[model samples]
Target: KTVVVTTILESPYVMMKKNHEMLEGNERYEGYCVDLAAEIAKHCGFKYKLTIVGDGKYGARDADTKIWNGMVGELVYGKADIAIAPLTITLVREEVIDFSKPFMSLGISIMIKKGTPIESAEDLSKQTEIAYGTLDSGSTKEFFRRSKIAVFDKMWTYMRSAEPSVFVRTTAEGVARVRKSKGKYAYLLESTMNEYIEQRKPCDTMKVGGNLDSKGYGIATPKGSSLGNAVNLAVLKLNEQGLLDKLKNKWWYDKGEC
Candidate 1:
């Protein structure tokens, strides 16, 4: 059976090719996940089709309906056989799905436009002059929501109740908001993404301070899918052979504009 791979359109992980209009199917996209998927399939000996998650969410459960959305939903609903993206492995998500050994490690980071005075979560929490928020869904937001750390808890409290809505629905929107906020807005996102954006054209954003927390991105499968074990071994093999490092360089460094 051809494995159905669900992913998101997140940059540095998965994104449309510049000439995507002239391309077809998976060929229309390129990035870390694109290359990673090809590598995993080769190692695992399976044909796979890459499909973007319909809702663009990484994955989140609806508070009321309790239904999963985004890549997770696709897996839960049998719409996809696997998910290979920047999907963070969280405890809540793990309860419903199986994740391969982490293929990439990262942490929550702060994105600030050039010249932003904020240097840390402490800076953002202590004053109201600047606004900062995380992606509306996903592990980063959930991290803050459940954090017992005083700094993160305080930051989350401010963001959860902030008027004018500081939260962003997507990474692109968060970056755009930072660019246009004139040093008034900062975006909280994965360190990998922040680093990728810092290397892109115009290079106006920078990651500030240390990471807020550590996490990893894993390839996901349904709760009991037989493919889970094979995929996990493939990731480990790729890591040992240094293919994962090579792919990261190919997507994030070699093609970097800055």
Candidate 2:
């Protein structure tokens, strides 16, 4: 049986070919996740079909209502056999789905437009002129919203009361919002993605403040799925063989978004 793999078009991770419509699943693929999926399939001896997620949102449940969407929804609803997206592993997320061993690690970093008065996380919390937000339902957002730390506690008070739409649905939206707003809005996002953007042309944004928190990205499968063991082992093997590092540089460095 062919396994169904679900991913999204996120730069340096999963993206579509300019000619994606003209190609099959295998041919339509490009980016880090696509390549890693291919390697995982090889190691697991599984034939697969690739279907890109229509939205960039990671799956999450409503704090009050417990509804799910995004990758979590795909797995909860059985839309795919596996997800190789950069779905972060969180305690809340783990309660609903299973994740393979971490394949990548990153910390939450602050991204501010070029001229915002804020120079650090502490500064951000003190200023009312600048507002901060994170990708809706993403791990970074949750870190601030649920943190026990003093800095984040203050930050959470700001975010939860800010305009509800203050939360973005995707990283691209958050970036664009920061670019357009100058320094009025700051985005909390993964350090790797932030660093990748910092090196790009017109690097209008900068990562300020040390990482607020840390987490790892893991390949997720439906709970109790047979593929879990094989997928987890594949990641460890890939890590040992240096394929993970090679892939990171190939996509993040060699491409040189700068």
Candidate 3:
């Protein structure tokens, strides 16, 4: 039987190669999650087809409409059997879906252009010259919008009232904006993606200061999916064997950049 695994085209995590036209099966989507999915499928004794999310949005309940997108909607409506994307686990999302123990841990951080004079996330709250924002409809944005911490509480106030173009819809766009702005704008995004990008060529963006919040990427399945136990166990086994770390370095460090 073939399990339908839904993912997204996020860089250093999942993307199509220039030669992807010649690839098939799991080879079509190659990255950290792609490799992890293969390992889990092998251990679980199942076959899977990797597909990108129909909508390029992560699963965040709309503050106004309560609608969801990204992998969350795919699993919620049975469009996919599993989600092997770098989907973050959250309390609200957990209520509608079941996720395996986190495969990777990360938190939100700031990616400022070189010489931004912003020492940390705290600076974003105190200054207005270096305006900050996160990928719209992303986990990092939600973290700030929902946070009660001192810096975040104030930062959120500034982001919500910023200009329309301030909120980006993707990490790539945010990074490009930071590069072009030349210290005028800063991007708040996942530490995993930040660190991964910083190591690439033209590494102008740097992850500074402590993370704003902590979270983990999960192998999520539908609420009543029968393969949940097998998936979770497979992840645990992979961690025990150091396969997960191996995959991370293989994709993150070995691949250069997105």
lDDT of each: 0.93, 0.85, 0.87
* Higher-TM-score candidate of 1 and 2: 1
Q: Taking the tens digit of each residue's C-alpha lDDT, what string does model 2 give over 6-122? A: 887788788778998998867887988999999999999999988876555687787687777787888888988999988889998888789998998899988988777777788
Q: Using alpha carbons, what is the TM-score of model 2?
A: 0.94
lDDT of 1 by residue, 23-76 (tens): 998899998999999999998999989999999898989999999999999999
Which runs in model 1 stand beyond 4 Å of their true positions? none
Better by lDDT, candidate 3 or 2: 3
How many clashes in each structure?
0, 0, 0
Give the Cα error of residue 206 in candidate 1, in Å.
0.3
Clashing pairs in 1: none
Instruction: Sort all candidates by lDDT, best to worst.
Output: 1, 3, 2
How do all models score by TM-score?
0.98, 0.94, 0.95
Candidate 3, residues 70-103: lDDT per residue as tens digits?
Answer: 8898898889999998899998899999999999
Q: Name the candidate, 2 or 3, with the larger TM-score value.
A: 3
